[PDB]
Amino acid sequence: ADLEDNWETLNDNLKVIEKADNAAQVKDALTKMRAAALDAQKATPPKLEDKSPDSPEMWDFRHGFDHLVYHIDDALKLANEGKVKEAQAAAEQLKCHRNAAIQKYL
């Protein structure tokens, strides 16, 4: 449930999606990404541990993962229409959201 472990999980599943041939392979990888994003959202960084939940610092941290989840869910909508190619392009765009949610807290 480490933040770094959740980042690894997200990158593992993005690779699976880029290699995928069918929408079910993509769907399963996106499902795992959503779980990893929600687990990451719980992994408050040591430097923010003492911050109030209502603090702007924690608002930013939490909501980076909310945003990643929103678009994982949009990519799921595509995988659930058998649109393998469209869901793969949506997945590629998740890298930017992943970076925005996690990179500055590593």
Ligand SMILES: [V+3]
């Ligand atoms: V958005």
